[model samples]
Target: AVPTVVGIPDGTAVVGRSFRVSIPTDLIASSGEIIKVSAAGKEALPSWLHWDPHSHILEGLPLDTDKGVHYISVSAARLGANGSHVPQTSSVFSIEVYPEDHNACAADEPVTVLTVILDADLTKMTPKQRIDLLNRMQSFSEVELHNMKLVPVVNNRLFDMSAFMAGPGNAKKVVENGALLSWKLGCSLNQNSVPDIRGVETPAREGAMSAQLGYPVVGWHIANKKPT
Candidate 1:
């Protein structure tokens, strides 16, 4: 009898996150099947995802470029003499990898993403300025604080720090690092697009460093409209 393949994983995958699934050869076939998984058209799986022929396990951490639907073909064949065996049966499944936090809000829902680059340092700003920023930062859960301007820039900029950065010196670094960290945190900041920020719920090394180093976050500006 042809072996049955039911080991495909359901739901969309996330970038930069660990993804795993298994093909139970014992359950799918008795004598066991020589499992070979690959992308559609026999393309090799991306370097991140791995297939263990011995264990029938598919495991790996999805990379940034691994987004979008990946049509995978999982083939199996009953144990047989060398060179005498071929894929007796094949099954196909399409797995989608969404950009970080792209799924946080529904495609048609209205959301405000505070794309804080990262928490800003308190070195340049005055004590009062720092306190004001801190007060506004605490309101992340309730209100949108990205519009709260900070210190006065020498070049005549309104210290407008909607993107909470860890460092105060580099204009892009805070949002830059925040955007970088946001990449890891699932909320990326686009230079041309509006930025979105997140809270401390999600933890990362740079995020923790933001806590230890005292940096802020960013707010993503997504142009999503809801359907009536």
Candidate 2:
């Protein structure tokens, strides 16, 4: 029978950070047999991860898409006396990659407000009509602005504070809120004094905001926008 390979236990990693796991030499087959190693799993391994067959190590940096539990099966095979192959598989192990800010804030820390401006005209519309209009206008696609969740505000009053604060962080909150606000308000923040229905463009500004936040600014911009 092939001896089991063992070393590192299940572990955790941070997104966008380096990670490593290895099998100890002591756990390898004691017989003078040649051994080979490999990794397999249900989910596809991230492109960043690399497996070293000889050293029995797996190392890599994880990306945003890798934020979750990954179950991997590590196996070892040995050459038998008759030149046949004997194989042994380890119990499935897990690697969990958390979001960058998973440990940044304390459990008791107060949530901070991230504000974004929306340019629109509510002058001629009723309160209910204003809500419906804001909802309908968000159905349009506007580049990076399309996939953001927005909270419409009129006269400095937010339509929904809960939805606004539920975004990933400050940057996401502002981008999403501003997008909805723009649709309801009839213009962009840059054109606060101009009430015409001129389109809004602020990709450069939004990109910078996302960069500072360490994650993409994502939200619901269109009705058909798929869930991420």
Candidate 3:
């Protein structure tokens, strides 16, 4: 048996967000036969399957309310002329629910920028080495993570470190290193956690030292501090 799973809205969704889902008739034929659609682990489900002759579709289904994971199930059985029945294959689909707080941040609100100084010390390591190190950073959580911005400073001047690490730095390392440096700097500066660098057997220690000593990796916390 073939299976088809779809979200009400399709694509990304926030909690409490409403959308419509459907189980196409082409997939489940035979009007007399009842097709069962159940959302496993979900609190809500369709009132029941009531086929529409004109459109040949199902409607009035409900989904879960809480923020978590869920599964949906589909199955049916067709009655034969001799009182025998043929069952269709069962199917399942997974759903992910994002927390309300996840989307709570104001879209237009201003945020702060975190700053840091790489200095000449980092120069002792090659660009490839530095990139590799930055790529290992972790992500930030609500209680601790803040909006991040990267502003590379080299030799007391502004430099575009966009290419410093891979993909705007490591998600995890950003949180870990940011948390550590924020306390040390006595100010918050969002820095890339991970740096992705490839194709290097060994890095230059002197270059690392020079880069660290010469550059100041600065971060910024760009929140609207103005009084409303």
Best-matching candidate per TM-score: 1
**lDDT tens per residue, model 1, 183-220:** 22223334344333334334323354245325543322
- Candidate 2 per-residue lDDT, tens place, 1-228, comes to 544446557778765344667755346545454444333543344454556666666666554556788766654556767888776535456788787432222334333222334333333233333333333433232312222223334345433444222222124343222323322221112223323322222332445433432323333221111111
Which runs of model 2 end up more than 4 angstroms from their true locations? 1-8, 31-46, 54-56, 80-84, 102-228
Q: How many Å off is the CA of 135 in candidate 2? A: 48
Give the candidate number with the greatest lDDT. 1
| Per-model TM-score versus the true fold | 0.42, 0.37, 0.30
Name the candidate, 2 or 3, with the larger lDDT value: 2
lDDT of each: 0.45, 0.42, 0.32
What are the RMSD figures for all models against the true structure? Answer: 13.3, 16.3, 17.6
For candidate 3, give the lDDT of residue 174: 23
Q: Ten residues in a row with the worst lDDT in model 1?
A: 177-186
Ranking by lDDT: 1, 2, 3
lDDT of 2: 0.42
The TM-score ranking, best first, is 1, 2, 3
Which residue segments of model 1 deviate by more than 4 Å?
1-9, 54-56, 79-82, 102-228
